[PDB]
Amino acid sequence: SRGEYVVAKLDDLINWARRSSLWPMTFGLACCAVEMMHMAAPRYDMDRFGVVFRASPRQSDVMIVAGTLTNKMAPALRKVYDQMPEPRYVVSMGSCANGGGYYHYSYSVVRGCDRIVPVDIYVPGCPPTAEALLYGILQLQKKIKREKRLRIWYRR
Amino acid sequence: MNLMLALLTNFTLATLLVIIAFWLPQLNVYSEKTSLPFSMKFFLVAITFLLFDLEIALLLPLPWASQTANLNTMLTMALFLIILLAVSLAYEWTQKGLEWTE
Amino acid sequence: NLTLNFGPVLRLVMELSGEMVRKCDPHIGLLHRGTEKLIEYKTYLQALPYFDRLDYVSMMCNEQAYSLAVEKLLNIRPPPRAQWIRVLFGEITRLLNHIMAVTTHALDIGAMTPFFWMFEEREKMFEFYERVSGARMHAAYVRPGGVHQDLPLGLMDDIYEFSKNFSLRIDELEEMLTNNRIWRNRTVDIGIVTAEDALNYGFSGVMLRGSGIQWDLRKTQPYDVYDQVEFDVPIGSRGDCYDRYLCRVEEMRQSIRIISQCLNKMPPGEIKVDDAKVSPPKRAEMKTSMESLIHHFKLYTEGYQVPPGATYTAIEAPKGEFGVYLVSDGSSRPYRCKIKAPGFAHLAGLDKMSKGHMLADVVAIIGTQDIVFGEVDR
Amino acid sequence: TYKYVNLREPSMDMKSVTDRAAQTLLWTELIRGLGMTLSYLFREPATINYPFEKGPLSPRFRGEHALRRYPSGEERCIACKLCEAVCPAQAITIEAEPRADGSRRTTRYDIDMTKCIYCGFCQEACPVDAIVEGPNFEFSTETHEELLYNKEKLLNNGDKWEAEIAANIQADYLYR
Amino acid sequence: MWFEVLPGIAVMGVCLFIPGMATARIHRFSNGGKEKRVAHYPYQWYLMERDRRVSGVNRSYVSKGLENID
Amino acid sequence: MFMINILMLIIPILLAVAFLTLVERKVLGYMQLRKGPNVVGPYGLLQPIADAIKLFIKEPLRPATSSASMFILAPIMALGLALTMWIPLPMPYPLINMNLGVLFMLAMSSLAVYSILWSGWASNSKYALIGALRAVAQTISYEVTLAIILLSVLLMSGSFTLSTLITTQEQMWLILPAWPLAMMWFISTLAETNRAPFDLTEGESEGFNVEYAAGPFALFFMAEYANIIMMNIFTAILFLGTSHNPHMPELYTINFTIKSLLLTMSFLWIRASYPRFRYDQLMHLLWKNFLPLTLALCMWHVSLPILTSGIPPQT
Amino acid sequence: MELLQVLKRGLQQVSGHGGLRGYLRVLFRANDVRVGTLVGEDKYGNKYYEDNKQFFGRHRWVIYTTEMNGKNTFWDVDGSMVPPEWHRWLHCMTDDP
Numbered sequence A: 001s002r003g004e005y006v007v008a009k010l011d012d013l014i015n016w017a018r019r020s021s022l023w024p025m026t027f028g029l030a031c032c033a034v035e036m037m038h039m040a041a042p043r044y045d046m047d048r049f050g051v052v053f054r055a056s057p058r059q060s061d062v063m064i065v066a067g068t069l070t071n072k073m074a075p076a077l078r079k080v081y082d083q084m085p086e087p088r089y090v091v092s093m094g095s096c097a098n099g100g101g102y103y104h105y106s107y108s109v110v111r112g113c114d115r116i117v118p119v120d121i122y123v124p125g126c127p128p129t130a131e132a133l134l135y136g137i138l139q140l141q142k143k144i145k146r147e148k149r150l151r152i153w154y155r156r
Numbered sequence B: 001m002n003l004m005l006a007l008l009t010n011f012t013l014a015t016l017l018v019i020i021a022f023w024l025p026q027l028n029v030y031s032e033k034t035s036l037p038f039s040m041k042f043f044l045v046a047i048t049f050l051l052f053d054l055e056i057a058l059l060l061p062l063p064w065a066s067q068t069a070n071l072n073t074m075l076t077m078a079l080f081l082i083i084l085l086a087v088s089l090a091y092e093w094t095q096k097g098l099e100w101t102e
Numbered sequence C: 001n002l003t004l005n006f007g008p009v010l011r012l013v014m015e016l017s018g019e020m021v022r023k024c025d026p027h028i029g030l031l032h033r034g035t036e037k038l039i040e041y042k043t044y045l046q047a048l049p050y051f052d053r054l055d056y057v058s059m060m061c062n063e064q065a066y067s068l069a070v071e072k073l074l075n076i077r078p079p080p081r082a083q084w085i086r087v088l089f090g091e092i093t094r095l096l097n098h099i100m101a102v103t104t105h106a107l108d109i110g111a112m113t114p115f116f117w118m119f120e121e122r123e124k125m126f127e128f129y130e131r132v133s134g135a136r137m138h139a140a141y142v143r144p145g146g147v148h149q150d151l152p153l154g155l156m157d158d159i160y161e162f163s164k165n166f167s168l169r170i171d172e173l174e175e176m177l178t179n180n181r182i183w184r185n186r187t188v189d190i191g192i193v194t195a196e197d198a199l200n201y202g203f204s205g206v207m208l209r210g211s212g213i214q215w216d217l218r219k220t221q222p223y224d225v226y227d228q229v230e231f232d233v234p235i236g237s238r239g240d241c242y243d244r245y246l247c248r249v250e251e252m253r254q255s256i257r258i259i260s261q262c263l264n265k266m267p268p269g270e271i272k273v274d275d276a277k278v279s280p281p282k283r284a285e286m287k288t289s290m291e292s293l294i295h296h297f298k299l300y301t302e303g304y305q306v307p308p309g310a311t312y313t314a315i316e317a318p319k320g321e322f323g324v325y326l327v328s329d330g331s332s333r334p335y336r337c338k339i340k341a342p343g344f345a346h347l348a349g350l351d352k353m354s355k356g357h358m359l360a361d362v363v364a365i366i367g368t369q370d371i372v373f374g375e376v377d378r
Numbered sequence D: 001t002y003k004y005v006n007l008r009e010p011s012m013d014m015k016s017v018t019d020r021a022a023q024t025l026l027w028t029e030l031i032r033g034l035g036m037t038l039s040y041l042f043r044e045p046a047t048i049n050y051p052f053e054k055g056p057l058s059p060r061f062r063g064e065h066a067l068r069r070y071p072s073g074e075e076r077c078i079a080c081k082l083c084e085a086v087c088p089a090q091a092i093t094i095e096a097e098p099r100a101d102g103s104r105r106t107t108r109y110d111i112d113m114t115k116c117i118y119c120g121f122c123q124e125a126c127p128v129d130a131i132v133e134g135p136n137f138e139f140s141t142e143t144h145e146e147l148l149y150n151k152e153k154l155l156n157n158g159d160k161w162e163a164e165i166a167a168n169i170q171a172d173y174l175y176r
Numbered sequence E: 001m002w003f004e005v006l007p008g009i010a011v012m013g014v015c016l017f018i019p020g021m022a023t024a025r026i027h028r029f030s031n032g033g034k035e036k037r038v039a040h041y042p043y044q045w046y047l048m049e050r051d052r053r054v055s056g057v058n059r060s061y062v063s064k065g066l067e068n069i070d
Numbered sequence F: 001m002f003m004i005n006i007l008m009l010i011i012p013i014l015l016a017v018a019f020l021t022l023v024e025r026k027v028l029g030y031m032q033l034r035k036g037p038n039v040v041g042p043y044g045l046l047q048p049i050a051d052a053i054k055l056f057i058k059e060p061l062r063p064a065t066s067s068a069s070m071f072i073l074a075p076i077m078a079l080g081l082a083l084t085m086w087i088p089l090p091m092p093y094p095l096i097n098m099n100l101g102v103l104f105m106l107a108m109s110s111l112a113v114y115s116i117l118w119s120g121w122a123s124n125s126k127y128a129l130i131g132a133l134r135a136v137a138q139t140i141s142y143e144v145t146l147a148i149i150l151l152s153v154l155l156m157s158g159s160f161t162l163s164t165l166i167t168t169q170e171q172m173w174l175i176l177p178a179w180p181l182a183m184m185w186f187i188s189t190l191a192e193t194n195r196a197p198f199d200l201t202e203g204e205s206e207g208f209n210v211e212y213a214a215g216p217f218a219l220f221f222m223a224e225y226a227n228i229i230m231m232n233i234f235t236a237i238l239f240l241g242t243s244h245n246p247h248m249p250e251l252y253t254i255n256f257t258i259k260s261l262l263l264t265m266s267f268l269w270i271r272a273s274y275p276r277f278r279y280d281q282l283m284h285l286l287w288k289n290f291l292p293l294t295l296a297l298c299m300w301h302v303s304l305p306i307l308t309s310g311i312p313p314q315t
Numbered sequence G: 001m002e003l004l005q006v007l008k009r010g011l012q013q014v015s016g017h018g019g020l021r022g023y024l025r026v027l028f029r030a031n032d033v034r035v036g037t038l039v040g041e042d043k044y045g046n047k048y049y050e051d052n053k054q055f056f057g058r059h060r061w062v063i064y065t066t067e068m069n070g071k072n073t074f075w076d077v078d079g080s081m082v083p084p085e086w087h088r089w090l091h092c093m094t095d096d097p
Ligand SMILES: CCCCCCCCCCCCCCCCCC(=O)OC[C@H](COP(=O)([O-])OCC[N+](C)(C)C)OC(=O)CCCCCCCCCCCCCCCCC
Pocket: C181, D024, D025, D026, D027, D030, D031, F180, F182, F183, F184, F186, F187, F235, F239, F270, F274, F285, F289, F290, F293, F300
């Protein structure tokens, strides 16, 4: 068949692997981290999707920003994101990391982690239920499944 | 000839796996990254291991020494070394040599 | 002395001499959001959700401290049934807090299994929260004047079922830690605090009771209906991490003792003060009576006015002594709300409690204080 | 009333000392830990098979904000701005003016879903049950702008979920 | 349930079984259906070399009985 | 036919390591009331494949290293020696039949300590170097007891030949007369292999492979998981010897394999049940508790055959 | 023997889904091969089941359709494909389907 067909099946192989071994580095900053722990708890068992409970920043594929990002913590967050080997995705959890939430008008709060790092999935809630966070992780898996990295390379 | 072949195979395979693991990722051509006070307790444990290891080197041939006809002498010399190995441990123990609280 | 900046929401600048710690200097503010300055631009009702987010493991105990303080300035009194729903949900919330404290403390020193067993129970106690308020964590259920809504039918039956089987869950936790020699070695004679220094450093809660001080606000300065329930206050003898671990495990058992009595002694009646100028009227009578509609309109736009004055109200929160210093100027917005988080004083004693210990003992000491940085930083 | 947790003196008779000697040498109490973890291997796990199974909720659950109508299709909201005044996070922005027929209706009704703390005060303060929090908790997006709802999104949510909002209110309206 | 952990264990059991089965079969394939000769000491090596000469062929696993005598 | 033999050893070793990651995650999951991987493939059987592919197409992480050549030497040594410790193992016929196989395995495992040291050197992090020095001290300390305990068991077998441990146990398992040594041997393998409760290298809130991410990190992981099986295979031969029937060799492998697996499972069982030691508490467990007992039992087993006329044969 | 009816249940699951092909379809789509009573089916193709012998949380589940609103959902299923009327019964907000 056409060359695109072959290159488009290698893409599905790598995309299948990447979305089946998502290793998150959780930035547990505030109350939202308690719901993140409840996603690893027996009822939802994130590990059964291939999402290990906790991994070191150098081994991580996705960063979950779960809590209020303050002006003091902002530079430390961007340093962990710069040291993440690619491909790297960012998931914003809760209203604080989305747009500041209850502290949007504070003098010491960054109004959304999207001001510091790029974000792939926004999860609304205060806090999102462990089921809503799981729904947001499964939506990132579908986003990795629509990637066309090799198709773009072939037609360059 | 078989041991040399086996050793060559295990370290040849380990070499290929390493070099490909340092190159296969380097084809995505990602965007350019653009980014002790000496402790005397660690040395003491290292040395104490060496002196015990040498004492063990003198105990290794015990299985063969049990076959001799001078068993009375062999037994006395075997327990002498182990007792001297126990006295060495007992000396460091009582001199605070096994402690980690600075 | 090697200096290590163990940065990240806690940053410790430690001065090590080989293995021992010589100076521990916590740096905080990584979770400072200016809660106390926002509360001044909110009404008294609009500031209730802020207290759920101070110590986000003991949500409904935080709400209770604020409500008691505002009721004291108002000079009103919640009805008896509301008081029993607050003692009841104040002891469910103590199980949530001690499970997080004990399991996360054990998870940092290696023991990973008890976290997953006991966090299944936390999942069931979140359903009680979601069945009375609709939110799993930040219920905003306890409010000045009582509670928002009455318990739904069938809730007290489920709470009874959960209470029958919980003691067995604590026993499994104790079969893994209490007599384990590895666990005891990591806690016994670690972080010893003397009774006189605990008082002078500002400690409260188990930090006092672990060192022998016989003090518990639920028995010395009772609030709500804590004087109508019978329970024991466990006291340690050694003042180390192991004693405080036993104290937290025993308080979990005595919480089940209180929950058993609250279910049997729950009285009928209303669940919020029958004063429409403080608590809103029911929607049925807000749509038929002019007076009720007027009062609904004002309590949700302007709020109720609080007489001028200042108060400091403290409760025996699971972490320790939680209180607010609330100042009123005679309007519907607070003039000043100082929050006394128990972790602020406990984390300040880390340098003293960590003297003569090892680097790995600091993790155990931080976990025995039950530190949550939502309340430390506010 | 108080109790001591660790004020028991170990027995020093010969049998008791030998019991603690056998425990130290034969690792008796470390093998109980193995037993407890072996029991859990043969217990049924508490995991549910999401997204094919869901976690139980209640009619009071607070989820995605939504706007309702009367049975005749008329909007319930009459632009009283009580929800705008009690929102702790200042997430509701409302503008109103007389409609073409003289009714009191809104020209703007925006909720910043990234400022909302999902607290439920707006549905308590509404005197006509116009704004509610629905039972939906799966609306994660891929851009920050999709979480800024305007009147059209909120009215579409009400038309999308009315079948479930109506039955949830019916099951709880006698408590509120 | 717990028995769903067995499929993963089954693969490990088969994988660890192959190395011991392969060597046993290969040795019998290369030594005329007998166990590979063990020679730890020079006496046992001297006899093996002798059997290589007596074999006629240059192999020590070809045995000659009471038919090369007379 | 020998080159085929090696691949019949090397290749199934890596597959066993590949699916040991799956089993560890499920056994831990079911002990923690979870399910573990059960989505990627039926019952998680494709999960190892997904991780391996992902780790080998992930961006390299190597920062500046002082001795970059030493950066590549460390993984090669770790994986070459891990596979080399399998060649003398009787199952029931060794690939290479050594007369001093036991010394060979002792010697090879004492050289693996260089992988930890070279990795710490090349990391260009003075803090990581401290982490590597702590690991080396732990490893060498427990090599003392592995050697003495092993010496005490060979005084009942009569030689350093691994194949001779099958004959020594033809009537009875060696655990019965040497269960005190089995307990200390089993716990030293945990400490020698850097496994919980002795895995203080993973004291995240309290390692030396941090500088590695993806690719070479996977190779170190396989080297460690390959040693767990080998050590538990060594324990089965040493203390749980299996009967050998020359006319049915495959029966030995089945029984031998089951014992090796059950001992590999117990490693996962232990990690799920206990907290970890401090560094100074797992150094006192060796110098002040095990070593005093190991020396005493070494004296006992030197004189036990002599005073009972039970000295084993030399040949 | 209780040990034999365990195997019997493992077999009635193969027939419960309509043969090997149906058994493998649910195994690779839902990772669960249980058999329960059919409570209904919506206009989008989703089928809803029920088994009250299972512990709370697993006594209700849905097998999503293979095509909704013109989108192929054989592998790409989503939790938002449940219509509002069934959303209430699926989350145990009511006992009435
Ligand atoms: C005629 C007979 C004459 C000869 C008789 C010779 C034998 C006499 C009996 C000797 C007693 C046996 C000694 C056993 C070794 C005891 C080691 C010791 O000292 O412990 C103290 C040590 C330390 O004890 P401690 O921490 O309480 O402190 C001791 C010192 N003080 C009290 C002063 C501080 O404890 C441990 O070793 C625990 C290690 C952690 C273990 C965690 C994993 C447990 C796994 C359990 C499963 C094990 C399976 C083993 C089977 C393997 C099968 C292959």
